[PDB]
Structure 1
Amino acid sequence: GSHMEELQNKLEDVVIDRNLLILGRILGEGEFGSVMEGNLKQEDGTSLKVAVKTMKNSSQREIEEFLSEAACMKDFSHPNVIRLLGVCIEMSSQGIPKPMVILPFMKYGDLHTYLLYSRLETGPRHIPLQTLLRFMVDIALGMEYLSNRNFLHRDLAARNCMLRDDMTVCVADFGPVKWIAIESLADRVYTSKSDVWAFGVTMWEIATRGMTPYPGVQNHEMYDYLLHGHRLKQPEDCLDELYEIMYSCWRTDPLDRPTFSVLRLQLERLLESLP
């Protein structure tokens, strides 16, 4: 049918031949896998600098799920959503297949680190309120796009937002207890309104210039803390208007939280009103 037709079309475009790809040095590495710099030889002859993420259920079933999921993500097209360039599956000597995700290289890195570096002399300069709000608008735009097409991010945070060369923010690294909505801690349930909660936390990260959420509260304490109605406190010199917007993202009833489209309008309006 059309459902299967649309799936098979998407699966065609997603794979990249390993020979079109040169790996470079390791940028990050941990339990989940590794991120490396690389070069992707394109159809026009020239090479493109890329980031290559290698990821660790070793079975063929898991690989098929990965390729299908990758096909969907490859289909995203919005300037505030990271564009997946393709995937390569390299193989190991023990027979274990190793999936690799190819992404545009973002020399300015993730937004969280950038906010922290901005408080250091040698890093980027002090970030004014207008720019912080612009980061939030950009993220709201990307999430608005994603929720329109019923894609749940599942791990929205400043560390998973990337800065492009023009300082546009894009959402990335699609799925951290302190970013998880109260209902999702409770019932293991997750909607676009759970993403909205995470977005509020991300707004708070940006306005505090990279503070960890809920200082003095342990991860194991988080459910009971939220259960009694406590929320992230207003940062110092944060506009009450801006605080109201982030606060609305953590209303207890998920149906009372605004949509991303609503939040995005609110943020643009506030940004407009600044001198």
Structure 2
Amino acid sequence: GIHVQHIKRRDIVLKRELKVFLAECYNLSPTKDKMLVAVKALPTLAARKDFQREAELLTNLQHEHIVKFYGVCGDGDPLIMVFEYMKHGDLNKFLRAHGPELGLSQMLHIASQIASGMVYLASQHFVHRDLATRNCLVGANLLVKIGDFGMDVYSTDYYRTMLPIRWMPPESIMYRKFTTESDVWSFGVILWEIFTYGKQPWFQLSNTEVIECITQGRVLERPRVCPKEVYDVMLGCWQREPQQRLNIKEIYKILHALGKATP
């Protein structure tokens, strides 16, 4: 089996509520004596089993644009995972607070980083199923990473199981078919989110109507600050049939290249 990294409970010093805590952590950083971390704690039947599995996953599911997972903490009571600290909080919130401020080059840099994480995710055959800006974190210097924080203040983005329908393609709405291609669909919407400063897709629309409009083949309109090429990438994510969608490697290549070439 996968050996998850264990962190001594005594090496964590809680500081502040961020169900997640900002903490100092000792005996971790090669250099600095202590380093800031984010700490998540919970205790049920398929909580404890899910927790261990997730830790094993996150032990190797690691990449520059995935939230760094440091390991698990203590011996069980409570169950604690240790993640990197990203000072700027979740991207959704950050977008919204940097809205009518973020320029084109920055938005591309955000979008391209997320695509980069998704390229890694696809290479690992990992289907995320809940990709959206609310599930990204922002670090120093617009550093952006993908995590998976579950489905409270984004409760409206889910539909009574809980479904992030506004970020889902038709085949996921209908058959609950989730693949890299449905992740690609979501990415298209993240793209829309980014260029609208974290507005909710189909805000005017009830959940039922969203389900209707997605099934109908209707797509989000282009934001004012979105260059047509970027919207085109949006469309390639929103092809009705999944095998016709751009794959994440192409999307990243396009977004990366635009970002590099933009003042």
Q: TM-score range by the shorter chain?
A: 0.7 to 0.9
Question: For 1:53, which of 40, 47, 55 is the aligned residue?
Answer: 40
> Is the alpha carbon distance of 1:211 and 1:65 closer, same or farther for their aligned partners in structure 2, counting shifts above 3 Å?
closer
What is the deviation of 1:113? Answer: 1.2
Unpaired stretches in structure 2, ≥5 consecutive residues: 151-163
1:129 aligned partner: 104
Question: For 2:64, which of 79, 82, 86 is the aligned residue?
Answer: 79
The answer to whether residue 111 in structure 2 is matched with residue 108 in structure 1 is no
Structure 2 counterpart of 1:74, one-letter code: T
Partner Cα distance (2:98, 2:232) in 1: 25
> Is the alpha carbon distance of 1:37 and 1:131 closer, same or farther for their aligned partners in structure 2, counting shifts above 3 Å?
same
Identity score, percent: 32
Question: What secondary structure sits across from 1:79 in the alignment?
Answer: coil
The answer to whether residue 118 in structure 2 is matched with residue 143 in structure 1 is yes
1:23 aligned partner: 14
1:35 aligned partner: 20
Q: Which runs of 4+ in 1 moved over 6 A?
A: none
> Is the alpha carbon distance of 1:26 and 1:90 closer, same or farther for their aligned partners in structure 2, counting shifts above 3 Å?
farther
1:63 aligned partner: 48
Partner Cα distance (1:151, 1:259) in 2: 14
> Is the alpha carbon distance of 1:246 and 1:41 closer, same or farther for their aligned partners in structure 2, counting shifts above 3 Å?
same
Contact 1:156 1:174 in 2 (8 A): no
User: Residues 163-207 of structure 1: CA distance to partner in whole angstroms, max 9, x if unpaired?
Assistant: 121322111126522112221111111101111111111010001
> Is the alpha carbon distance of 1:89 and 1:20 closer, same or farther for their aligned partners in structure 2, counting shifts above 3 Å?
closer
Structure 2 length normalisation: TM-score? 0.87
2:258 aligned partner: 270
Cα RMSD between the aligned structures?
2.0
Partner Cα distance (2:220, 2:189) in 1: 8
Structure 1 length normalisation: TM-score? 0.83
Higher relative contact order (CA 8 A, sep 6+): 2
Question: What secondary structure sits across from 2:141 in the alignment?
Answer: coil
Partner Cα distance (2:217, 2:74) in 1: 46
Contact 1:85 1:104 in 2 (8 A): yes
What is the deviation of 1:53? Answer: 1.6
User: Residues 130-169 of structure 1: CA distance to partner in whole angstroms, max 9, x if unpaired?
Assistant: 1101111111111101110111222111111111213221
What is the deviation of 1:219? Answer: 1.5
Partner Cα distance (1:151, 1:190) in 2: 10
2:157 aligned partner: none
Partner Cα distance (2:207, 2:48) in 1: 32
What is the deviation of 1:89? Answer: 6.0
